[model samples]
Target chain A: RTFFVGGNWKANPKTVQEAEKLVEMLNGAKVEGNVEVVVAAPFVFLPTLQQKLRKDWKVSAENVFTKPNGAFTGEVTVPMIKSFGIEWTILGHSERRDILKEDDEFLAAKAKFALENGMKIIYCCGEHLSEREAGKASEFVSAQIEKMIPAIPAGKWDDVVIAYEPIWAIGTGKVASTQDAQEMCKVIRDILAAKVGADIANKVRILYGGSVKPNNCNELAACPDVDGFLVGGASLEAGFINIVNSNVHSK
Target chain B: RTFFVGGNWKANPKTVQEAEKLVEMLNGAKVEGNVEVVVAAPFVFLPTLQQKLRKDWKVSAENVFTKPNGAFTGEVTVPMIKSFGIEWTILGHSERRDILKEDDEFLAAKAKFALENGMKIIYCCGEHLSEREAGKASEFVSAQIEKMIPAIPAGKWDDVVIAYEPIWAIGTGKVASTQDAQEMCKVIRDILAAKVGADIANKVRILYGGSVKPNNCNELAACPDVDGFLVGGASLEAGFINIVNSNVHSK
Candidate 1:
């Protein structure tokens, strides 16, 4: 499988003029990041981006609610996202849980909705610094994985991408050692293996995100267990190109 | 000022192919209505619609949040929506306020955010059956209007559309009497006049909703107080064409 690099443009850009230039830069660049490049911008830009995006590039809504229809105002449903030909959705991000009071049941429902609607899901799971300090990071992430596993139909496990975003590390500019990230990814695989099977778990792409930069991208991507990167701040610039290419071998 | 009519296509279509067909149907339809036509679809279909629509047709987002930035998950902010050149947003629809648990402060903030970001707003205000039965319809709508008025600028009242949707009437085939709609609309104008000024109040389009059909479209449009209709089910059918032309006069 090719390495996949995705950018979550969370509520970004002040104007369409600026967004146009950003899309122009992305479309024109010859980045070494041969991985499949997918971008999730705020919903407003979804329609605009879909119009001008290059063939190699894919676009997404930052998030989608699991419900098909209802009185849920301010929340766009699964049918709404797929209407635009959008292929991916991010579910259960840490920020949503803390701010919007999103619970595990909600995430699982959303995941099921995405799968049933034929949309790919980026299922994110993470533990906070406090949880890690308490030595319960494994248990916390494990429980989250447990909730999401049954939500996926048996044959559709490959369509979901698991992103391990340590809540403490995101946007903090603190890179976990390669060993630290690889270890967590390995543990995640083990959990998936128990729930699904080793064959499916091995094929799933596990992404390491949180302050991944050009200088250290090689180290993290080179780890045997690291499948790809779910980049944050560094994703907005050319540095992301270097990070994308970390897994490409030189002759 | 020309009459303004906006179609709120709330999460209706499920694919871009369907969206393209909608645009085709809209472009080919005969619009004898003496007014400006606009449509607000789910954000996913906005751009595609914009691209294929006739130049006279305006576009809008169904809903947007007040906060322009930060980690608000599963939502797009006013700035993001406006930045994409979508000129209008529908705010405080009963579905949002009553079902999503959004209070007046949230509507006021969203209105403020939309104005600050260079977009017009369709501000929705209505009362439920209970409030109306209690003889508090005027008080309820007036209070909602009063809360939002302070957040709006003076001249910007021209940029706002007041959509009065009676909860019990919408989609239930229960039409509010011409007198009932006129009385409520007059009250809405009075509230705006008390808060902004008579000139601003007169210019603001106060549309009556809840089972607004082509049959009663002319009489409702003829009311001195009712500016137009915030159409629902009629919008999806051929009757919408007649509703649009309800105000035209034959020689």
Candidate 2:
């Protein structure tokens, strides 16, 4: 399986100039092995990224609205993103799930709208701190996936990437053990196998995200089920290149 | 009062190309009177609008996040918009209040952030159908303004423009009568005078927004308390010029 890394700059670097500068740095960075890199930025910065980022790497919107375009104020629609040649969007991020009050049904609807409208999705699913501490992480995450399952249209699995970032671990300097990361990814792959068939289960890429840094990336990359990462804070720094290069450790 | 007409292109046109083209048209349109025309568009379209829209007319964000920047996925911040040399933002539109579940407290926080960050605001507030039917529209809208009022820092009223667009009248073919629209703006001005003082209230521009058309623009513009308009669908058409030109009718 080819490794994939999406740099989600979740509302960072206050200026468009800084966003452009980051893309310039990413343009100069060298890729070490076979891997897919998608850079996601706030909607305002997407045009700049799309205009300047290297052709080899794709640009992604941090989120999108469900409609094509009409009266939904303050929303960036899929068509608007697609119009600028952006291909991917990260849906159901933990921050959006909690902070923005986005429920699973809403996210599922977003996924369906995005997929049906010809967009690839990095669908996020994970357990919160309470559920994880209760040792019910799998059950909680399974419920989220179960809601999202019927939303995927036929033949669209190739365009989907599942990301698991334990809410407790995200941006808290807490890293899930490589073994635990592998187990969650495996749990997700197993669900896909049971419900959607082994063909898609085996082919789908499930990523690990949460405090992934240059220091620990190689170990996490070596996990079989952890196809790659959805890097957040580390993505804003030059160390993101190190994480991207660490994909060489994956099979 | 400088007649203020903000053409709020709430999630429109579907493509960057179409957005740029719309700006091109706005760039060429002729102005007929003393007016402050601010074009508000989706986040993705801001850069193009700021870069291409007529310099005499300003650009405005349909909405903004409360924070400067950090960890809020998919939210555009005031600093980011200001970075592009854009100066204005439309806060608390009915579309956001009802469709997105944005509460008055959340909107007030956004207002505080945007105003504190040196941006002008076209703040929207209005009543629902039942509130109008019950003749409680004044209290409902006054309550919304009261929440927003304290969030405004001292010496910031100069940058504030309140927009009154009835929730029921918006996007529907129906419009508030000239007498009705004038009464609401007068109502808002009275709230400001009673709460923030007549000095600020008298200077503050209060705009009427709904299905404001080229045909009705002159009459709406003629209200003494109705300083201008926060136009919707008509803003998407070339007749927005007529709406802008209607500023001549304002007292």
Candidate 3:
């Protein structure tokens, strides 16, 4: 499996002009190694990102509504995103789950619909601060994954990528130790192996989504089971290219 | 106040090409009789609508995030909307409240932010089937208005338009009767009069949003307190012009 890097902008750079400028910066970066890169932006900016970004890389949406189209006001549906030729979306991010009150069922519905409609997804799952402190992090993440497992339709595993974002570490400026990321990813892979099969587990790409920066990207990238990263703050900065290049260090 | 007509193309026309076509139809519409028209489309289509729609009519967003910009994924912020030179948004639509589970506090925050940012808003509120069946429609809608009253920044009343969408009546093929539409709008206006005074009440436009169609637009427009409409499905069809011109019947 090729190493994967996804930049979750997570609603940054308040205007379209700024997004265009960011796209220019990304377009100029020189990538290295065997890595699949996807840059996810806010829904309103997806079209611009899709059109302006470098053709080698793919663009993704931060979220999508359950239905193709309907009377659900204030929502961007999958069909609308696909219409713009955007083939990927990030679902169940920690920010959406905690702040926006998105539950497992809601996230599962989103995952099911997007994958069924021919879109790729980076499905996120992780434990919060309390769960981590209590040493029940694995249990918490397992539950999140179990709920999402059935939602992926048969033969759609190729389009599904798993992102494990420890909610406690997200945006807190606290980075998880390299061992921590590897262990969590291993736990998820084991869960899939037991529930689905060993074949699917080995082929599926599992990513770590925490405070990844240029300072520590290489160490995390080199860890076994840490296939790539779903980067947050660093993704919007000049340092993002360095993080993407860290994929070369992976075994 | 000019009779206001807002075409809320709530999550419709599943593709960009279709949206452009819809804009063409709207641009060719010959608006009549002193009406202020605004076309509200999904966020993905806002930039297209704003650029392609006629200059005589303004464009609106189906919703806007309360914050100017931040870490709220799956949300479109006010600055992002303003970046495209768009100036209006619809808040608290029943579809959002019912299906997406938006509460009063959330909607109020959106209204406050949009108005403070110099954008107009068509804020929607109404009673559900149970409340109307129990003859508590007035009380329910009044409470909803009461919660929204203080959210409007001082001197921002001119930019705020109220839309009363009877949850039981919306898209159910059973529109509120002319008397029903007038009564609910009057209830909202009276609530405004009691809370914000007659000056603000008289100037604020209260619209009826139910199953509005070309056939009934004239009669509904003729009713006192029925200032205009926040049209839905009809807004996407050729019949939209008839609804826009229904302003001719308003006194």
Candidate 4:
């Protein structure tokens, strides 16, 4: 599988002009290595990003609603995104889990609806600070993933990519160590192997999502189980290309 | 002030084709009476609605984030909506309040941001089943409006419209009695008069938003304090024009 890098421009660049400038920067970046890049943005900017960003790189929605449509106000639905030819969405980010109160059931339903509607998704799962402090990180994440397992339709695993975002590490500037990321990725892979079989586990990409930057991306990419990243703050800056290019270092 | 009739699509139609068809219907209708019509749709369909809908009827977003932008995934913001030349947004809809759990503070921030940033807003306020059943509907809605009062910037009331939706009447096939709708609108108007002053209250349009249909719209439209409607189901059907035309009865 090609290493995947997703730039989640989560609610960024206040104006359309600024968003256009960011898209121009991404479009002008030099690419190296076999990597698939997807840029997830706010709902209002998706059309601009889809039309302007390089075709080699795909446009993604940060989240989507469970229904195909009807009376779910203030929500973006699968059919709506599909109408624009967008193929990907990111689900279950810690921000959504914490700030917006999205539960496991809500996220699982979203994943199922997106995949069943012909869209790929970057599904996120991770443990919070308390779980990490209690040494129950694996247990917490496993339960999260377990809830998501039944929602993925058979044969849709190929379209699914998992992102492990440690809630404590996100935006706290306290990123997990490369070895810590590797351990969690391996733990997730092992869980998949135990329940869903080795073939699916091996084919699925496990990404490190907390505090990824140009400086640490290479080291994280080199970790055996770290297939790629779901980059956050660093994704909006010029250093994003360096993180994307770090895919070459995956060994 | 011209009677303002806002058609809140409220996540209906399920497809862009259906949305375009809905636009076609609105465009072909003979709009009688003096009414400022705005059609609010889901975020994904805003651009198309703005472009394809008749220029006489403006487009509106169902909701927007408080900030101009940055890191709130799945939220559309004022700048993005404004960038498309869209001038109106519907905030604090009953669906968002009850289903999405948007609080008074969150809605206040949205109203402030939208009004401050040069966008007109259809701000919604109403009482739920318990509050209405408890005979505290007046007190409940009064507090909702009071919380929103301070959020409105000075001299911006011209861009502000209030929608009083009795939650007990929404989507239950139980429409608010014309008297009930008029009473709530009057309560909201009187609250504004006592708090902000009579001049502001007189200038501001108060809308009735429950289960408004063609059959009942004229009666509701004739209510003294009912300036217009923030329609839901009927907004998506051919009957919407009839509701818009009902503004003639306001005289």
Q: Name the best candidate (by DockQ).
A: 2
Q: Model 1 over residues B1-251: C-alpha lDDT tens digits? A: 46667776665565667767877877887878468677777766666766778877788888987787655656777666665567888898887776556789988988987887788888898998878778899889988898998888656777889888888675555657888988888999998888778888878888876566777887777777777776665665667767777656311
| Model 4 agreement with the true structure over B1-251: per-residue lDDT tens digits | 67989998877767778888999889999988899999999887887888899998899999998888777776778888888899999999888998889999999999998898999999999987778778999999999999999999999999999999888776555656889988999999999999999999889999998878899989989999999999888999999999999999997
Model 3: per-residue Cα lDDT over A112-214, one tens digit each: 9999999999999999888988999989999999999999999999999999987877666665888999999999999999999999999999999987999
Q: Residues B131-198, candidate 2, lDDT per residue (tens digit)?
A: 88788999999999999999999999999999998886755555578899999999999999999898
Comparing candidate 3 with candidate 4, which one achieves the higher lDDT?
A: 3
Give the winner by DockQ: 3 or 4: 3
lDDT of 2: 0.91
In the range A121-208, model 4's lDDT, one tens digit per residue, is 9999999887888999999999999999999999999999999988867656565788999999999999999999999999999999
Tens digits of per-residue lDDT for model 3, B1-251: 67989999898889999999999998888888999999998888888887899999999999888898777777788888889999999999998898878899999988888899899999999998878889999999988998998899999999999999989775455557889999999999899998989999999999999889999999999998999999999999999999999998999
CAPRI band for model 2:
high
DockQ values, each candidate? 0.39, 0.89, 0.80, 0.71
Model with the higher lDDT, candidate 1 or 3: 3
Error of 2 at B150 (Å): 0.8
How do all the candidates rank in terms of lDDT, highest first?
A: 2, 3, 4, 1
TM-score of each: 0.86, 0.98, 0.98, 0.96
Q: What residue pairs are clashing in model 1?
A: B33-B244
lDDT of 1 at A154: 66
Interface RMSD of each: 2.5, 0.7, 1.0, 1.4
Error of 3 at A187 (Å): 0.7
User: Residue B132 in model 1: shift from native, Å?
Assistant: 3.6
